[PDB]
Amino acid sequence: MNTVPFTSAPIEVTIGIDQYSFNVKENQPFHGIKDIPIGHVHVIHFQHADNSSMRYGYWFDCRMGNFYIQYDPKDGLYKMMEERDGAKFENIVHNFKERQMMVSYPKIDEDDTWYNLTEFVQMDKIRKIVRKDENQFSYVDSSMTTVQENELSDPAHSLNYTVINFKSREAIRPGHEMEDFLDKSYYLNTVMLQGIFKNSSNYFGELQFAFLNAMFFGNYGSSLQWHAMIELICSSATVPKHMLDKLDEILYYQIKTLPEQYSDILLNERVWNICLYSSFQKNSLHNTEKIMENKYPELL
Amino acid sequence: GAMNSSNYAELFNNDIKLFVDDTNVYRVTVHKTFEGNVATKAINGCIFTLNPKTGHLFLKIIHTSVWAGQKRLSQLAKWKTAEEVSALVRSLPKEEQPKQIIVTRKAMLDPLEVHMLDFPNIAIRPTELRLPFSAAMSIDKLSDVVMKATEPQMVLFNIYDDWLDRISSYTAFSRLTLLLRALKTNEESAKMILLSDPTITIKSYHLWPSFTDEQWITIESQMRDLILTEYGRKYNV
Numbered sequence A: 001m002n003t004v005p006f007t008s009a010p011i012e013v014t015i016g017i018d019q020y021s022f023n024v025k026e027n028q029p030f031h032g033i034k035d036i037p038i039g040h041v042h043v044i045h046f047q048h049a050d051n052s053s054m055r056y057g058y059w060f061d062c063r064m065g066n067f068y069i070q071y072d073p074k075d076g077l078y079k080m081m082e083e084r085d086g087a088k089f090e091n092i093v094h095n096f097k098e099r100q101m102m103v104s105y106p107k108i109d110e111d112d113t114w115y116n117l118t119e120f121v122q123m124d125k126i127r128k129i130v131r132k133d134e135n136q137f138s139y140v141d142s143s144m145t146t147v148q149e150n151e152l153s154d155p156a157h158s159l160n161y162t163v164i165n166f167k168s169r170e171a172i173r174p175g176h177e178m179e180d181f182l183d184k185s186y187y188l189n190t191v192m193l194q195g196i197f198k199n200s201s202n203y204f205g206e207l208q209f210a211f212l213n214a215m216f217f218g219n220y221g222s223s224l225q226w227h228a229m230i231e232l233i234c235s236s237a238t239v240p241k242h243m244l245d246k247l248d249e250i251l252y253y254q255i256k257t258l259p260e261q262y263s264d265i266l267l268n269e270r271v272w273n274i275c276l277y278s279s280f281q282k283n284s285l286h287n288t289e290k291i292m293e294n295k296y297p298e299l300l
Numbered sequence B: 001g002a003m004n005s006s007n008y009a010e011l012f013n014n015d016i017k018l019f020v021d022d023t024n025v026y027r028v029t030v031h032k033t034f035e036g037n038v039a040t041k042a043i044n045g046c047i048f049t050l051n052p053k054t055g056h057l058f059l060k061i062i063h064t065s066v067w068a069g070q071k072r073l074s075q076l077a078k079w080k081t082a083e084e085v086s087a088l089v090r091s092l093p094k095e096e097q098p099k100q101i102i103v104t105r106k107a108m109l110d111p112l113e114v115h116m117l118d119f120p121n122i123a124i125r126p127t128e129l130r131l132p133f134s135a136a137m138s139i140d141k142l143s144d145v146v147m148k149a150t151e152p153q154m155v156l157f158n159i160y161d162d163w164l165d166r167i168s169s170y171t172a173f174s175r176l177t178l179l180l181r182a183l184k185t186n187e188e189s190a191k192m193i194l195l196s197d198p199t200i201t202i203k204s205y206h207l208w209p210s211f212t213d214e215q216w217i218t219i220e221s222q223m224r225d226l227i228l229t230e231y232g233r234k235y236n237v
């Protein structure tokens, strides 16, 4: 189990760690989060009590270094940093644990939610979507735009998701216009899976990362990406059977975890009704269709 | 954006544009089978592609053989239309290609956009106008060439005959749509109006009769009457 210590908490803030969250008061004696499960990526995220504008946070993998949080009063945010002195770090964490100044990552033993939401998400791929190579961890916030959003303005601060566009020469083979537009299997299997992503695990990883950025930061561009990757599969007549089964599990856990009160902005009616009721795969997402119908029957 | 009452004069500026109407592309007769079921039999159709400034009508005849062995024909017809319009544009010199293509039915937007991806600078636009181009097959010479075709064929007509020697393209288009609206609302009456006087003939390269300016005003008046009437006869007013 790993630890992300905090130097201090000078401003009142709601802190999230994965799907958990807690409130820290201004100058409360808070020194971080312990017992973080090893083997998964994680996200630690923040919403200031005084400015609900800008949710922001950091994707990280404790196997890649010793990371801590320190508020910066000039830039006005909690910043993740790497501590290179391993003996300094262990000594800091041990003192904070002995004084019991840390919250415990509060995983229930039965609970596979976080694994199920991040199964295919890798830190190395996150770092290619979020480019800042001098750090091992990746900052995301509510306002960051995607490369595709920029095409339609600071590139350093962009989300470089794979561009998907159903009315594009990449998506449509000359002479197969109608075929490729109504059945996107070519674009899914040859262009995207074989060509760009290499395998379905990398595809699912980006799909999962996009959902999580939409959910945790209300990042609109990420929501667009999540829906596009779903729609590309559902609009393909020819999808490997193992991918459909896995997609159903992926989406089931995303819909299960979504805040009930955010469904109106985070779920696109057109995509979901098309995917569950009109698309080639309308009959292939049994778990997802059941949870959607029982939890958001209004959207449909 | 969409073409409507407010931006109507844009049709007659000097930016090349084409209207595309797909109504008459896939045409059928519905009939009973010996077993008493219902079947369709396709008949020849046409794409109606019109330059509203010049009257240039590129009439692509759709022969029934293009439907053989195909499913979902109403959907295929929109993609066939887009394929042929794309082929037409590519066949024109660069300086003759349109800067905009206006489709008369919104369901043509995605088919045409996808076929024209090679032409990102050609705007594909819908319209809110309820244009009467479906009545093109009520023009005898156009109907005749479509029904006689034995293979795919493109036939060229000026839909304005020689009118542009005497009137502007705004006026010519208004006359065209009045004639076609009338033919759509009551074909028999419209055709009676146009031919009642045997001394006025249709030139061999023309589609409509050789009315003088004064006779066109009368003709145009009679077409308005017809349309207002049928609107009463229809709604009882």
Ligand SMILES: O=C(CCOc1ccccc1)NO
Residues within 6 Å of the ligand: B055, B056, B057, B058, B156, B157, B158, B161
């Ligand atoms: O004879 C002409 C000029 C060429 O007319 C057309 C007609 C249809 C398509 C292309 C050109 N004016 O009457």
